[PDB]
């Protein structure tokens, strides 16, 4: 299934994920593609911050959903 | 000085802050106005998440800037 990962700074990342992938997995997939270290990422769906160990299905994130990416970088 | 706090879910909060306010004071101000607990707030400027102990000025947040707000939610 296809999900868009949109940055607050503009850019849309398209990914092919499995419905049961953990959020940590999506992060590894973003790293795969963009090179942004998982540790640096914060994923958000419906205005909320998502947790690592949960799955896309747990959050009701379905085909064509949009997630947001925020960076958590050293020293603010 | 006037800044805006936009949610990732279409709501703009207009605030009057001092250029030297820490990020935690702005959260206290959002709480005062929207009732959202400071603990459930994550503030973002230019695609990156903000540290509670730094000031708006440390991040070069000037008049009319837009900050974003995400919730780091847990219980119920």
Q: How far is B73 from chain A (nearest CA, A)?
A: 7
The two structure tokens encoding residue B34: 């929207």
- Closest partner residue to B8 among A7, A44, A73, by Cβ? A44
Inter-chain CB proximity B49 and A68 less than 8 Å: no
What CATH code would you report for B1-76?
3.10.20.90
Interatomic CA distance for residues A34 and A46, integer angstroms: 23
Nearest to B54 among A7, A44, A76 (CB): A76
Inspect the interface and report whether the beta carbons of A70 and B48 lie closer than 8 Å.
yes
Given a contact cutoff of 8 angstroms between Cβ atoms, the answer to whether A46 and A65 are in contact is: no
Which of these, B5, B12, B45, B64, lies nearest to B29 by C-alpha position? Answer: B5
- Using an 8 Å Cβ cutoff, are B20 and B56 in contact? yes
Contacts of B72 in chain A (CB under 8 A): 48-49
- Contact call for residues B12 and B75 (beta carbons, < 8 A): no
- Show contacts of B53-56: CB within 8 Å, 24+ apart: B53/B22, B53/B23, B53/B24, B54/A76, B54/B22, B54/B23, B55/B19, B55/B20, B55/B21, B55/B22, B55/B23, B56/B3, B56/B17, B56/B19, B56/B20, B56/B21, B56/B23, B56/B26
Quote the distance between the C-alpha of residue A22 and its chain's center.
10
Q: What resolution in Å is listed for this PDB structure?
A: 2.3
Nearest to A71 among B7, B48, B59 (CB): B48
Radius of gyration (Cα) for chain B, nearest Å?
11
* Unique residue bearing structure tokens 């929207």: B34
Q: Are A33 and A13 in contact, with CB atoms under 8 Å apart?
A: yes
d(CA A40, CA A27): 9
Contacts of B2 (CB under 8 A, 6+ apart): B14, B15, B16, B63, B64
Calculate the alpha carbon distances from B54 to A4, A14, A70, B49 in Å. Answer: 32, 34, 18, 12
């Amino acid at each position: 299934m296809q999900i868009f990962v949109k940055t607050l700074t503009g850019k849309t990342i398209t990914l092919e994920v499995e419905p049961s992938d953990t959020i940590e997995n999506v992060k590894a997939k973003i790293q795969d593609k963009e090179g942004i270290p998982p540790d640096q990422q914060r994923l958000i769906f419906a205005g909320k911050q998502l947790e690592d160990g949960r799955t896309l299905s747990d959050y009701n994130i379905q085909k064509e959903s949009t997630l947001h990416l925020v960076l958590r970088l050293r020293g603010g």
